[PDB]
Amino acid sequence: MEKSKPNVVFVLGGPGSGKGTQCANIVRDFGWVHLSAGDLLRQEQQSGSKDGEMIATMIKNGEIVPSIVTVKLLKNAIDANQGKNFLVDGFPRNEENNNSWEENMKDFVDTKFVLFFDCPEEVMTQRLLKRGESSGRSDDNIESIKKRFNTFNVQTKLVIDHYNKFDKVKIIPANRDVNEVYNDVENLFKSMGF
Ligand SMILES: Nc1ncnc2c1ncn2[C@@H]1O[C@H](COP(=O)(O)OP(=O)(O)O)[C@@H](O)[C@H]1O
Ligand SMILES: Nc1ccn([C@@H]2O[C@H](COP(=O)(O)O)[C@@H](O)[C@H]2O)c(=O)n1
Ligand code: ALF
Ligand SMILES: [Mg+2]
């Protein structure tokens, strides 16, 4: 009767592991709000800030943008959507992301688990090249893609391992057809009481 603070699920995975694809299904069936940090950042550069050409340069190189930009974008959207729960997609991608979250957000959300989509690099590469045929994204090319893998491997995997220490990671294998992946996703969110 006091208002419940939002539930948050972090959705992580390599580049092109299918986070956005599966998050759209969850929005559809469960009515959570999907916040893709990458989308939000592409939005922020596309009208036409301050930070816009930094974001462009870092995205093209597969680098993680300074967390004050990204966490502000997440927090604004969350604050605009009282009484919803949130799929925070592609964040946190390093320890700075995670610390800046805890600093800003921690008393105001119940962050529940990390949903991790596990996929082979070689499969991700093929998806991302295919996507790049029509996505118009500056990072869907062989150069950027391999830079994105290194950033994932070096920075992001440590974050997932950190959450896994506290038993807060749910792993779904993502090297199958999208409906087979989603069947498991839908079953998980049902089992978690959502
Ligand atoms: N299970 C899957 N099998 C094959 N293609 C997939 C699968 N999941 C997503 N895709 C495709 O791979 C690409 C990357 O998926 P996307 O969800 O955008 O990735 P990300 O994890 O970067 O958000 C898209 O073109 C998407 O349609
Ligand atoms: N937490 C995040 C999420 C995305 N990004 C940037 O946006 C790019 C695209 O991310 P997505 O694949 O999640 O859309 C990343 O490779 C990275 O350069 C970021 O800097 N910080
Ligand atoms: F999360 Al992506 F390409 F959109 F890695
Ligand atoms: Mg995405």
Curated annotation (Swiss-Prot):
Ranges for region NMP: 36-65
Residues annotated to bind a ribonucleoside 5'-phosphate: R42, E63, I64, V65, G90, F91, P92, R93, R137, R148
Predominant location: cytoplasm
EC number: 2.7.4.14
One GO location term (cellular component): nucleus
Gene Ontology molecular function terms on file: (d)CMP kinase activity; ATP binding; CMP kinase activity; dCMP kinase activity; magnesium ion binding; phosphotransferase activity, phosphate group as acceptor; UMP kinase activity
Record keyword Lyase present: no
Residues binding ATP, per UniProt: G16, S17, G18, K19, G20, T21, R131, R176
EC supergroup of this enzyme: transferase
GO biological process, one term: 'de novo' pyrimidine nucleobase biosynthetic process
Pfam families reported in the protein's UniProt record: ADK
S-S bonds: none
UniProt keyword annotations, A-Z: ATP-binding, Cytoplasm, Kinase, Nucleotide-binding, Nucleus, Pyrimidine biosynthesis, Transferase
Co-factor: note: Binds 1 Mg(2+) ion per monomer. The Mg(2+) ion binds to water and substrates.
Reactions performed catalytically: CMP + ATP = CDP + ADP; dCMP + ATP = dCDP + ADP; UMP + ATP = UDP + ADP
PROSITE patterns (alphabetical): ADENYLATE_KINASE (PS00113)
Protein family (similarity comment): Belongs to the adenylate kinase family. UMP-CMP kinase subfamily.
HAMAP family, alphabetized: Adenylate_kinase_Adk (MF_00235), Adenylate_kinase_UMP_CMP_kin (MF_03172)
Described function: Catalyzes the phosphorylation of pyrimidine nucleoside monophosphates at the expense of ATP. Plays an important role in de novo pyrimidine nucleotide biosynthesis. Has preference for UMP and CMP as phosphate acceptors.
Subunit and interaction comment: Monomer.
Protein name: UMP-CMP kinase
Organism (species): Dictyostelium discoideum (Social amoeba)
